Amino acid sequence: NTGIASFEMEYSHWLQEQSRRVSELRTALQSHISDIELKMLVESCLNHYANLFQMKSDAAKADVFYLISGMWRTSTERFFQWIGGFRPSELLNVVMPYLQPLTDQQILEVRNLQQSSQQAEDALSQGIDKLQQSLAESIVIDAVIESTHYPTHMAAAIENLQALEGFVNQADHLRQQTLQQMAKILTTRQSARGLLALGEYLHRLRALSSLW
Amino acid sequence: GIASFEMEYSHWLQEQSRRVSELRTALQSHISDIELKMLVESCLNHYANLFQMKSDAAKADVFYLISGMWRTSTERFFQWIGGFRPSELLNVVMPYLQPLTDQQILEVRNLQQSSQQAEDALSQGIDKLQQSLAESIVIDAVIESTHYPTHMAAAIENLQALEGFVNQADHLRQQTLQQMAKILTTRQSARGLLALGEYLHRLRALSSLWAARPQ
Ligand SMILES: CCCCCCCCCCCCCCCC(=O)O
Ligand SMILES: CCCCCCCCCCCCCCCC(=O)O
């Protein structure tokens, strides 16, 4: 599959650029980086995640079931995975202590963002659950007849799986919206601390299957 | 140990297909009620063999087991705790049990709801363990130095608790199977097991079908 081959190599380069951004963040939060310089770094990290979503959107058009299944990810990432990636509300919870100290108004805005994300996440999962039910109904009809002498639902099951493409894209849109709203709630230094903890966590997660 | 589990499962599938085929033949024959009851009990005991095989694999490598890499990509798409949600398999096979009495339908629906409740309680347990793992991982990730000790004993050992969840999920599947056998007549149980087995088999072929789609 040419598209997935293209994706795996783009993702390999994405991870290397991501590692550079995380190192820049780690050094910036120890250096005398100016505020405007740190604003541009924060924007570059957000832009780098937007490029991930664009790559994934193109991979979804070549093989959305491969993308959803996360076999391009590690075993540990797959343990946590939700619709091609992570749930944004859970990543927010993971980094939340490393943003502190936040004002009470910011903490409440972060919590309202996490709740709104949790509801959007559940709506998408309930949508996927509806697609799975329709696939299951197609499949059991073919399974109880069990004969190629009688027409099957194979075309309809493929279209069911192809509809996952819209769920991947909307999950990535949610991830993007949560990143961007977090960048509006947080000061620049708080955003940098958040992206630092986020990036280090995602990196460390990957190299955890070796540990087990 | 995982190597052994995969060979047991390989053979377990060969004999599953034989029991499914035997059921399909019986539901076109004039099998006696006692012979059908023996075969229904052969299928229920064959599922018990699966849960015991998985329980032994969970002691060797629970993370492998619960990941479902020993299954197909389609099964993993539908996966809840190393297998299927029994509440959803019940829904898939229900039209094929019909016709049932209104009381049976009610007892089936109550069993599904009680299963859904137990499934969500287990998933909430897993979610708490994942949150505990993540919080341990981010501490090591933010320090990111071999100069400082890590939480990989905490990580490895509370991932060990996944064994308890795998075992109770299988206990819930076996409980659901045996409670359905009590609600249904032998012949209805035969039809349910036939549709269940046929569904599980065909569901595995979904990944091959996707692979061959027009591109
Ligand atoms: C300004 C940034 C603050 C930190 C934000 C942390 C929570 C944002 C969650 C969305 C980020 C998604 C990136 C990972 C992609 C995936 O799920 O695979
Ligand atoms: C007469 C009962 C029919 C309805 C079935 C209710 C729950 C059945 C539970 C058995 C699940 C076993 C399948 C595991 C998947 C696999 O690895 O093949």
UniProtKB/Swiss-Prot annotation, chain A:
Coiled coil feature spans: 104-137
Cellular localisation: Nucleus
Keyword line: Activator, Coiled coil, DNA-binding, Nucleus, Transcription, Transcription regulation
Keyword Coiled coil attributed: yes
Superkingdom, natural source: Eukaryota
Chief place where the protein resides: nucleus
A GO cellular-component term linked to this record: nucleus
Single GO MF annotation: DNA-binding transcription factor activity
Annotated ranges, domain DOG1: 4-212
UniProt-listed GO biological process terms: defense response to bacterium; DNA-templated transcription
Family statement: Belongs to the bZIP family.
Assembly: Binds DNA as a dimer. Interacts with NPR1 and NPR4. Interacts with GRXC7/ROXY1.
Protein role: Transcriptional activator that binds specifically to the DNA sequence 5'-TGACG-3'. Recognizes ocs elements like the as-1 motif of the cauliflower mosaic virus 35S promoter. Binding to the as-1-like cis elements mediate auxin- and salicylic acid-inducible transcription. May be involved in the induction of the systemic acquired resistance (SAR) via its interaction with NPR1.
Protein name: Transcription factor TGA7
Gene coding for it: TGA7
Section covered of the full-length record: 149 to 360 of 368
